[PDB]
Paper text:
[name] (fructokinase; [name]) is the initiating enzyme of fructose catabolism, converting fructose to fructose 1-phosphate. The [name]-A subunit has two distinct domains: a central α/β-fold and a four-stranded β-sheet. Gel filtration and nondenaturing polyacrylamide gel electrophoresis have demonstrated that [name] is a dimer in solution.
A sulfate ion binds at the expected site of the γ-phosphate of AMP-PNP, probably impeding the binding of cofactor and substrate. In the crystal structure [name]-A is an elongated dimer with appropriate dimensions of 44 × 101 × 47 Å. The dimer interface is formed by the extended four-stranded β-sheets (β2, β3b, β6 and β7), which pack approximately orthogonally to form a distorted barrel. The overall structures of [name]-A and of its binary and ternary complexes are very similar, with no significant differences in main-chain conformation, except for a small region between residues 113 and 116 (Tyr113, Asp114, Arg115 and Ser116). The electron density around residues 115 and 116 is weaker, suggesting some flexibility, and alternative main-chain conformations may exist. In contrast, the structures of apo [name]-A and the [name]-A ternary complex did not exhibit a similar closing down over the active-site cleft of the β-sheet clasp region upon substrate binding and the [name]-A and [name]-A ternary-complex structures are very similar without any hinge motion as defined by DynDom. This suggests that the structure of apo [name]-A is either in the closed form as a result of crystal packing or that [name]-A does not undergo a conformational change upon substrate binding.
Author numbering:
A (entry chain A), B (entry chain A): 3 to 298
């Protein structure tokens, strides 16, 4: 069984659990503080692994005790780390995460880039024959476009049977990332990006942006409590309602869980409509649990 | 010149500077993240040192890289650490501090006690003859009352000329701490404690609580932008208006700066009225600066 490769950046989430969202200028005693491995594509590997799909993670890494914590954790999920790009400068990024016990909301304070990104030349070294799906978390787009061109060139020399399926996520509302819309068989665009571009609903965003994706591609937009929508070459808008848990306790990585679950379902040969449904359900289940493990 | 001893707990402040206060459930890129030594009595040593008063700090400590950072920092200010109480269990407490660049507000997320407190038996080892003033940050009150009884017993065997002046801070609205009101020549009570007990202004709190302090004591209550008030045995309410800086950039430790500056002024023989004024002015100056060093 060929692997699913995720290219992205691992982040250390330093999570403070509070009984209510802190009022500016107050002092509040937290219920707990914990470390959790995070990062979008990183979290998606966790979920893919939990769902039973062998996968590999490619990201930059700075040796030290933080690296040990996050790499050990990836190893626990049997994520293949052959393509870890070790950097002799910079550090693993940290995100300070406030979770409101009352609501499950997650509020993320993150920082400037703390280490070099995975480059096109790094990706050149990947043995593409090992993978049936490659997902790219949009970040350093000019480099990633080259990576995507490399996969495309590879696929031209392949039977349709042996083509590597590609997905990309455009989550941050940064201009440089929009070029990624034209790559990938599946394109995840965030609600935040949609709203930044002036769309007020997933349906609106999908209709508004479909003209930018590559021929044959499926564009997917999750819209929180409003569920998720997709639009493919046939012009039929597809939708799944959200599947909230009875009590929301932790929504950190819920979007990553959605992405992973859609990739999983699609990679398993399911329809887009079913993949959306499955994504919403697994993401919802996740929101009712601390971290990811209880989704299975 | 005998030292001023501060008994309290050193804290590592992990400070995230943000351009606006984060909205719940958002993700925000911080401007910077820095480590700063904190803790109330710890910060007051910094200020006392900067103002030119030799001082000593007594608190619990767990060896490790965090201890090294905070102890090196205390050494930079020439704070005497002879009475550091090393603990073979627990860790230096962390406080997660969000500072709003726009307002200078500080929002503090702190955690359960991470190491043993300084005990009465620890304090027994202090050479009281070395100190002309001892300030206690209220925390483990039952133990600290014994410490205060030890100082009292010491002072009975002294000339008035050689009596150690004592101050206590009651900052958290915790019942156990109220017993400390009856100790100390100078009693700092926080606005938060006052409000918890049903008073709506410093004047109200002082009148409301003076009957609980020891004969001769001065009760002090700072009330933020409303300045600070004090009440002594003569029943005359004293007041200083706040002295805001032209632009408030960082209010973390402003209250500690006030406390230290009042202790300093009083220890220098100044009147309570002048000490209040001086406290408000130095605290105000501090609020216009990052950290403490520019106050002098």
């Amino acid at each position: 069984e060929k692997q699913i490769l995720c290219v992205g950046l691992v982040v250390l989430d330093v999570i403070s659990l509070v009984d209510k969202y802190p009022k500016e200028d107050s002092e509040i005693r937290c219920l707990s503080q914990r470390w959790q491995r995070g990062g979008n594509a990183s979290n998606s590997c966790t979920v893919l692994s939990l769902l039973g799909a062998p996968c590999a993670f490619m990201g930059s890494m700075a040796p030290g005790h933080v690296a040990d914590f996050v790499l050990d954790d990836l190893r626990r999920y049997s994520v293949d780390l052959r393509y870890t790009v070790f950097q002799t400068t910079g550090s693993v990024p940290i995100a300070t995460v406030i979770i409101n016990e009352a609501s499950g909301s997650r509020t993320i304070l993150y920082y400037d880039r703390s280490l070099p990104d995975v480059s096109a030349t790094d990706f050149e070294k990947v043995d593409l024959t090992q993978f049936k799906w490659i997902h790219i978390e949009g970040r350093n787009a000019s480099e990633q476009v080259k990576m995507l061109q490399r996969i495309d060139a590879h696929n031209t020399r392949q039977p349709p049977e042996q083509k590597i399926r590609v997905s990309v996520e455009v989550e941050k509302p940064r201009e440089e990332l929009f070029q990624l819309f034209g790559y990938g068989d599946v394109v995840f665009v965030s609600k935040d990006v949609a709203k930044h571009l002036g769309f007020q609903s997933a349906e609106e965003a999908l209709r508004g942006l479909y003209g930018r994706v590559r021929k044959g591609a499926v564009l997917v937009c999750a819209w929180a409590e409003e569920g998720a929508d997709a639009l493919g070459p046939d012009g039929k808008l597809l939708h799944s309602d959200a599947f909230p848990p009875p009590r929301v306790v932790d929504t950190l990585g819920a979007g990553d869980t959605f992405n992973a679950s859609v990739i999983f379902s699609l990679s398993q040969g399911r329809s887009v409509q079913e993949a959306l449904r499955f994504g919403c359900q697994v993401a919802g289940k996740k929101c009712g649990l601390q971290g990811f493990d209880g989704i299975v």
